[PDB]
């Protein structure tokens, strides 16, 4: 919460419909009735849902918290079935959202216990891994299309090695870490550029260019992080002609990484931006490059493609 | 009955821990299968089905509501134990109390950092937000530095400032029992520290100050509070009136 | 180990780490000041400071010298020392949390096994 979780969930939906003509499903595993209804009207107000026409880009599946273990146990599958259709029948690129993946597992244990089976380590189900795999595995790219799943994860006891979370990681291809701190910088989406990771971030997969840029943005982001401590204490000045550029750039970078969502136009009074991968690499490429060193920070805040960074500077004298 | 009939009702479950135990006892005696902590597989369900019944209806239904304050008793602060885990996971937030805090003098022992309200400001009045917002911020900022105090052999005046704001605001949060205040009284007091009026005051006096200050305004200034209440916020006017009211009172105070 | 025991150390080492970290920021500050004030003067827990002189130990014009020096060296030493102390404390917080979670889990399993064991004997 506080961090743009729903808004981000809604932009993705939008962007999937837009750039891939793919639809989305939303599976609420153990949803709080209050929160469901709130999600409903939120989607609506943002368009993703349309009660008047036939322009809705999402289907909603709900397994409320009051429902018995078995129901909260299946709801994810149900949602799965739905998504599978937009892939196996119409070969699109669906989006699957499971909120939250933990409640799935938990629902599993409850059913298990009821079936009188002996729990395993930490009380989970003896079938923990299977329960998970028979589900996760349906989420892939077949020849017909592909289902992509955004799973909301809840780590128990902050223990990454807890059986529940641990099991789950066995199936994740990437993490998207929303951060309250980032949000505090006014930066949105509030995604953490250093904590968020992807398995495909391999030059062998994204290509040397993409791979290098990424690895570039990150290091700078890392370096600046170091200096952060110095700046505040010993004051921003023992900084070299070099140390002063890493900062400047980084600061521009941090901002260039923020962005206006079309979902949030309704009352942000700002037009959304759906930056293209090509435009994305280019943008960061240049900042790294030093092409816009003359440009000022605020120029990059909440824009789309670098071109906008340039124009914003204009309007900023 | 209230909820459904356009009315508003508050409910306190004290505790859900004991109830869970009652249920467990029955389950095991009936010989149903035991899970972690010997709890049946449907203990989560027992609470979820309970706690969901509370809700805010639509005018179409009467606009009536049912708010719930369920109590959970942790053990050695283990919020992650079984039953605490469920309920935490079911509710819209938590008010976390600590013994350390309590004994340290913070009463109520609310651990501000760890407590939450998913609903948030959507439930705060404009008046409160008008003050709550900056308070929340300096506190969070203090929380970052707090540990330094006791060894701050030479901190800059930047952070040294947040240490001060920190302890004062903290003192403002203290409270006696059986004496719940009106939203207008709370903002008036909060405003004092938040604006910086108590910064130069002695930490040992904030409790006394508030007491007396609030006695004064409740006595003398029932028109401003009425305003604050009514206008729902702190008008530029009432704001100025408060400035004088505290600046003069303070003066009086340190005679 | 006892979760109550590990919680103690953890509780504490968490503190020691923040203190220690705080002391360095200080030590860096004074040390900044010192490097500057040092400049001119030459044209005239603190690491292994007090000891180094101590061991080897068995006006004004120079008094201000040994002084103006012995403070750069000190504020230097304290800084690096506290830098590594928290570096240590961090390795520890990370290490202890690991033991915490192993135990935490183990405790749960051990209980559950006990239950199951007694139930199955009826």
């Amino acid at each position: 919460a506080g961090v743009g979780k729903t808004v981000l969930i809604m932009e993705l939906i939008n962007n999937v419909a837009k750039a891939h003509g793919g639809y989305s499903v939303f599976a609420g595993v153990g949803e709080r009735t209050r929160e469901g209804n709130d999600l409903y009207h939120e989607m609506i107000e943002s368009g993703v849902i349309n009660l008047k026409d036939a322009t809705s880009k999402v289907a909603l599946v709900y397994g409320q918290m009051n429902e018995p273990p078995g129901a909260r146990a299946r709801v994810a599958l149900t949602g799965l079935t739905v998504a599978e259709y937009f892939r196996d029948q119409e070969g699109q690129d669906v989006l699957l959202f499971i909120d939250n993946i933990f409640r799935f597992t938990q629902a599993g244990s409850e059913v298990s216990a009821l079936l009188g089976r002996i729990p395993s380590a930490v009380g989970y189900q003896p079938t923990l891994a299977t329960d998970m795999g028979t589900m996760q595995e349906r989420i892939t790219t077949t020849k017909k299309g592909s289902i992509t799943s955004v799973q909301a994860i809840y780590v128990p006891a902050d223990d990454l090695t807890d059986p529940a979370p641990a099991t789950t990681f066995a199936h994740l291809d990437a993490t998207t870490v929303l951060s309250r701190a980032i949000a505090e910088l006014g930066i949105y989406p509030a995604v953490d550029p250093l904590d968020s990771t992807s398995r495909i971030m391999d030059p062998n997969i994204v290509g040397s260019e993409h791979y290098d840029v990424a690895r570039g943005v990150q290091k700078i982001l890392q370096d600046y992080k170091s200096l952060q401590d110095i700046i505040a204490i010993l004051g921003m000045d023992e900084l070299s002609e070099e140390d002063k550029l890493t900062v400047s750039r980084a600061r521009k970078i941090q901002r260039f990484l923020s962005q206006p969502f079309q979902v949030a136009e309704v009352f942000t009074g700002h037009l959304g931006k759906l930056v293209p991968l090509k435009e994305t690499i280019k943008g960061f490429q240049q900042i790294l490059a030093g092409e816009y060193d003359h440009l000022p920070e605020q120029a990059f805040y909440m824009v789309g493609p670098i071109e906008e960074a340039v124009a914003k500077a204009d309007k900023l004298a | 009955y209230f909820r459904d009939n356009g009315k508003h009702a508050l409910i306190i479950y004290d505790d859900l821990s004991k109830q869970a135990v009652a249920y467990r006892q029955m389950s095991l005696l009936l010989r149903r299968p035991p899970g972690r902590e010997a709890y049946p597989g449907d203990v989560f369900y027992l609470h979820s089905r309970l706690l969901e019944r509370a809700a805010k209806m639509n005018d179409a239904f009467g606009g009536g509501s049912l708010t719930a304050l369920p109590v959970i008793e942790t053990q050695a602060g283990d919020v992650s134990a079984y039953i605490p885990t469920n309920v935490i996971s079911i509710t819209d937030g938590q008010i976390f109390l600590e013994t350390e805090l309590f004994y340290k003098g913070i009463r109520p022992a609310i651990n501000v950092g760890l407590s939450v309200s998913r609903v948030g400001s959507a439930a705060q009045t404009r008046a409160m937000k008008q003050v709550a917002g900056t308070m929340k911020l300096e506190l969070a900022q203090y929380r970052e530095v707090a540990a330094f105090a006791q060894f701050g052999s030479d901190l800059d005046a930047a952070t040294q400032q947040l240490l001060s704001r920190g302890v004062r605001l903290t003192e403002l949060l203290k409270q006696g029992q059986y004496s719940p205040m009106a939203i207008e009284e709370q903002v008036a007091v909060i405003y004092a520290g938040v604006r910086g009026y108590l910064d130069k005051l002695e930490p040992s006096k904030i409790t006394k100050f508030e007491n007396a200050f609030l006695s004064h305004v409740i006595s003398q200034h029932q028109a401003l509070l009425g305003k604050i209440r009514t206008d729902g916020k702190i008008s530029e006017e009432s704001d100025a009136k408060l400035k004088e009211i505290v600046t003069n009172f303070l003066a009086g105070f340190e005679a | 180990a006892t979760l109550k025991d590990i919680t103690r150390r953890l509780k504490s080492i968490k503190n020691i780490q923040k203190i220690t970290k705080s002391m360095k920021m200080v030590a860096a500050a004074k040390y900044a000041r010192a490097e500057r004030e040092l400049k001119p003067a030459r044209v005239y827990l603190c690491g292994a400071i007090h000891s180094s002189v101590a061991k080897q130990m068995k006006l004004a014009n120079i008094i201000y010298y040994s002084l103006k020096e012995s403070t750069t060296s000190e504020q230097s030493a304290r800084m690096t020392a506290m830098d590594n102390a928290s570096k240590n404390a961090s390795e520890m917080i990370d290490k202890l949390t690991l033991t915490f979670n192993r135990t935490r889990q183990a405790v749960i399993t051990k209980e559950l096994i006990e239950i199951i064991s007694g139930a199955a004997a009826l």
């Binding site: 902050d158 904590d195 968020s196 | 283990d78 919020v79 | -």
Partner: peptide, 15 residues
């Protein structure tokens, strides 16, 4: 320890 779970997703960039 005991109430850590009220931080949360804290070591997330490690997963």
């Amino acid at each position: 320890x005991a109430x850590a779970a009220l931080x949360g997703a804290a070591x997330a960039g490690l997963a």
